[PDB]
Amino acid sequence: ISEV
Amino acid sequence: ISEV
Amino acid sequence: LFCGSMMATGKILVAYAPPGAQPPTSRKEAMLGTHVIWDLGLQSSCTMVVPWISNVTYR
Amino acid sequence: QDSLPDTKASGPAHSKEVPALTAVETGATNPLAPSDTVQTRHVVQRRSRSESTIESFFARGACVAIIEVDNEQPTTRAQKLFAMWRITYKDTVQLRRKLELFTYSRFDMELTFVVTANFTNANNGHALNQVYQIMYIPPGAPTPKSWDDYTWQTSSNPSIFYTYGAAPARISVPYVGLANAYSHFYDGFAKVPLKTDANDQIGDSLYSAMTVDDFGVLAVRVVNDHNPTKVTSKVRIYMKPKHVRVWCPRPPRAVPYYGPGVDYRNNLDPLSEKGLTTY
Amino acid sequence: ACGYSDRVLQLTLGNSTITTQEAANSVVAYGRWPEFIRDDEANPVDQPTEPDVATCRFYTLDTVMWGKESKGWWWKLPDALRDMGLFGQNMYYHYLGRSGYTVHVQCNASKFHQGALGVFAIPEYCLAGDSDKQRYTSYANANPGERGGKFYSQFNKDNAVTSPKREFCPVDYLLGCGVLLGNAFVYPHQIINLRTNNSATIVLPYVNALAIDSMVKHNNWGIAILPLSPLDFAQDSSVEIPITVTIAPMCSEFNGLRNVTAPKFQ
Amino acid sequence: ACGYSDRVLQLTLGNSTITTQEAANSVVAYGRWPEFIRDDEANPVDQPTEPDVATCRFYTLDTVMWGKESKGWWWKLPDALRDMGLFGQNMYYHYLGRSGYTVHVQCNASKFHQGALGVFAIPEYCLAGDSDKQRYTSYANANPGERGGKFYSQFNKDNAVTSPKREFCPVDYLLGCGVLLGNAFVYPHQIINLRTNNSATIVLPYVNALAIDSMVKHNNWGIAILPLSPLDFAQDSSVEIPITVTIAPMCSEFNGLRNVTAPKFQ
Amino acid sequence: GAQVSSQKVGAHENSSTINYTTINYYKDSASNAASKQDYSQDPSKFTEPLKDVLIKTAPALN
Amino acid sequence: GAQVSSQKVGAHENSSTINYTTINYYKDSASNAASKQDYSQDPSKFTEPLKDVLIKTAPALN
Numbered sequence A, B: 001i002s003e004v
Numbered sequence C: 001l002f003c004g005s006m007m008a009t010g011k012i013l014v015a016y017a018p019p020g021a022q023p024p025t026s027r028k029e030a031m032l033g034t035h036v037i038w039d040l041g042l043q044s045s046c047t048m049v050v051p052w053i054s055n056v057t058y059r
Numbered sequence D: 001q002d003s004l005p006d007t008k009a010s011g012p013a014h015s016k017e018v019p020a021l022t023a024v025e026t027g028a029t030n031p032l033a034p035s036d037t038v039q040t041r042h043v044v045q046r047r048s049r050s051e052s053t054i055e056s057f058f059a060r061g062a063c064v065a066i067i068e069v070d071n072e073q074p075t076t077r078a079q080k081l082f083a084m085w086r087i088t089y090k091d092t093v094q095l096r097r098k099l100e101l102f103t104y105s106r107f108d109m110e111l112t113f114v115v116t117a118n119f120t121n122a123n124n125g126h127a128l129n130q131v132y133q134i135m136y137i138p139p140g141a142p143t144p145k146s147w148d149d150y151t152w153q154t155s156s157n158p159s160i161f162y163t164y165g166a167a168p169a170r171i172s173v174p175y176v177g178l179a180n181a182y183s184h185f186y187d188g189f190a191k192v193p194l195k196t197d198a199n200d201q202i203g204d205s206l207y208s209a210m211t212v213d214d215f216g217v218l219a220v221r222v223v224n225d226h227n228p229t230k231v232t233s234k235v236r237i238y239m240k241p242k243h244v245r246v247w248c249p250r251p252p253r254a255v256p257y258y259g260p261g262v263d264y265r266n267n268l269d270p271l272s273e274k275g276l277t278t279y
Numbered sequence E, F: 001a002c003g004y005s006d007r008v009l010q011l012t013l014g015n016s017t018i019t020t021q022e023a024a025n026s027v028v029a030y031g032r033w034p035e036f037i038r039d040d041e042a043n044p045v046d047q048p049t050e051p052d053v054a055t056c057r058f059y060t061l062d063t064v065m066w067g068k069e070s071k072g073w074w075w076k077l078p079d080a081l082r083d084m085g086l087f088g089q090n091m092y093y094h095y096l097g098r099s100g101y102t103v104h105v106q107c108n109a110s111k112f113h114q115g116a117l118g119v120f121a122i123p124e125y126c127l128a129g130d131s132d133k134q135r136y137t138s139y140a141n142a143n144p145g146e147r148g149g150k151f152y153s154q155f156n157k158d159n160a161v162t163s164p165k166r167e168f169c170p171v172d173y174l175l176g177c178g179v180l181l182g183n184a185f186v187y188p189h190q191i192i193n194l195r196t197n198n199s200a201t202i203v204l205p206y207v208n209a210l211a212i213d214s215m216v217k218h219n220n221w222g223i224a225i226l227p228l229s230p231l232d233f234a235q236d237s238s239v240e241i242p243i244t245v246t247i248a249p250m251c252s253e254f255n256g257l258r259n260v261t262a263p264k265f266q
Numbered sequence G, H: 001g002a003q004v005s006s007q008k009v010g011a012h013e014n015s016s017t018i019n020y021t022t023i024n025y026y027k028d029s030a031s032n033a034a035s036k037q038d039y040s041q042d043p044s045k046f047t048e049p050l051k052d053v054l055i056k057t058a059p060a061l062n
């Protein structure tokens, strides 16, 4: 994932 | 997973 | 490619004019654009590159 | 956070600094805030400009075309067994005006197709459910002459096969312009007339027009063979510019559009009557 | 320090120098100074021609007269400069050309004269035409050269269907293109208000959807000058003062050399 | 290594390329390549115009025919190039101009053809005239442009005192200037001997008593082409083959810009 | 390849930071939905295009 | 078994590297979609099939  |  | 006899000699001008002016009717006008003066001899063939000269990115 | 600047508490002033006076001749808009000319309190400002971002302003599906196509017996006179449409945002006024607040643009496009149909005549039996083919024909490709000629084989052209009653069809298209941005306005010509020309038709172009076909056409047909009874169908195309970027702002269109160019013809009087000293 | 001012400027390009003692600061369109095509934005692969001082200098166009009846004037670039010295030659000998511009509009009068000129620099200034016929304005008419074009207080439709004039009919309050003049201020601009200033100075970047293009086929910028407030003096109901437009090409470069373009302007 | 040769050359300047499969090496006049005016040799203080690729490229002049009766041909530089594209424009828009040149003379024939052309590059090629009248050759006559001039086997004095022709009368064995042709070899030169080579290639520096000068008033170099040995073929007593001259300006720079020089050539 | 971001919560239930998850199913970026998280900028290039931009408490013309 | 790759982003929103996720649901490789990430090659076998390939600044025939 890429939690921004 | 296999992130390419 | 020159498919003449070996004893035959000659000099030819091949050219490219980027768009926008009168299409060349004389060597005189043609000379002013991109051109190669080809000399006939042992190397039978001559290449002229038409360089990508354009306003738009893709024609 | 994207909230706007908080209002600052500002008190009385007796000074040589005069924010209220300026000179518009310079070309600049005077950057004043209420605290520059009146006494203000402190306001912790929570409002935001989220809904006026370029993306937000254009993030909506707009009707750009109604393509009418018929399914009926192939007679020998001009019919609508298939139809073609030049892709443009200009056959409609609403989206055209929004995009035209800007000189140049860049975006991907979402096309959504709403397809409705009905029976023409009182009765000749009924119709089994129809499947529609929407073929994109890029400039250069063979255009259809007949509703079922070889062009519809679509071996390289993109086609959508829509089934009547299904959820409205949808596709996305990339930024396909020949330039680094779509020109909403082109002060120029595709050809220059030269002194050495034979007729003067040779160098004649339409003012403000760029390429002849520009983006190509959508060809629409009903794949179904005809029933005894005729069915008329309409394809409504909704386009949405997504992942948008725009350059050079322009004044909004103030009078009604007269075709693809900036031309005006009538109703050149947009402004109402109002007395100078009447609130 | 010393005594420097917003009002007093000197502009020097090539062998040309302009002085102004009454300016109202100067505008750089869109905050962008003119620059050359960078390798990472380049498109024609051929080594460009950069004529520098011979073309990037101040060419003064023919003066126009501002009177009580004047509705407005307009010019297109590069078209206004097509016959200006070596710039014109470079423009017509090459398929491609890009150039930025310093625009200096001049109009002096007296402490007792009155009036205000709106000076606008418009990207892609597409103008409206003559007729029922859409997009029909002819090349020769769309391009007045140095002479420029004029504005009108109202739309007179070119009626002679048999032999159409094929001209623009630019109505002043519609900025000649179907929008309202008051909103033209969103374009890079200055105002010459006679009580305040002699001139306007607008620096223009190359603006286009492409890094370079055909200067003969397409105009990038339009200069529109309109009387926001009419000329007036003492009681003399027929006052007339000159407006002079001076323009310099900046960072000019050309690609695609061949024989010269000779457009038919008749 | 690989297979490189004296005889096979490629010359590329601007958007122009020349190929030759039968050259006889190439000459650099006086051992000096063309170069620009250095600051320590500069004289006009104004920033120069350096048009580069638009002017420094191969302009081909009109072809001449070599026949059994041909006595010789001559050209002057810059004059021969005065109407050649952007070089000509730059030349006439500026009081001052300097330029070097690559000269390429072309004449092919066949293994069975015979003859030899002497190709000479002369600094200050002052020619002799028509008359009893000394130093009387008119400007229009001293300057043939692209067309060039011709040589004669003997001196015919222009006799009509009443309306003098005011032309040069260049006698071939006197190099058109009172010296003997055989000694013309002290000038930078090549020979096109048909059994040996198709062409001549001479690179010329700017040579003058000044770092820069008026190109319209003064020619720096003269190109003289003479039949050292007459054209001959099999037994056909009326043989004729083409000679084509192609020239490129090199390291061209200009000073003193103003309105264009329009010389009266009639 | 899941993408996680915070929602700007307008009306709040009687229940803090709330999230939403995004996954791109297509290779062509054109096929993607809009992020709508967009950066704002200075009006300056439009409101103050001056060579010598002057400060509001000083005379515009000096 | 999720597969993650970078999209080549053409037009960019006013919002960097963007990804997409792929999962194969079927045992037979035939059932799979196309990767479209493909390697390019030399024209040489077609444009220069010579025993002694020669360099372009040298004579083709020697």
Ligand SMILES: CCOC(=O)c1ccc(OCCCC2CCN(c3ccc(C)nn3)CC2)cc1
Pocket: D087, D088, D089, D090, D109, D111, D134, D135, D136, D158, D159, D160, D171, D173, D176, D182, D215, D218
């Ligand atoms: C001045 C005219 O309008 C525009 O500037 C303008 C209008 C639309 C726009 O979209 C690009 C147009 C071409 C697209 C439109 C539709 N396309 C497709 C492709 C496949 C299918 C089945 N259906 N449609 C693919 C190509 C881009 C610019």
Ligand SMILES: *C(=O)CCCCCCCCCCCCC
Pocket: A001, B001, G001, G002, G023, G025, H002, H004, H021, H022, H023
């Ligand atoms: C990154 O995305 C790895 C985590 C994936 C979680 C499950 C995703 C389920 C949806 C996959 C769609 C595949 C589309 C071909």
Ligand SMILES: *C(=O)CCCCCCCCCCCCC
Pocket: B001, H001, H002, H023, H025
């Ligand atoms: C690798 O794929 C492990 C991670 C799986 C994430 C959830 C996938 C959900 C879809 C599963 C499809 C099963 C098909 C039989």
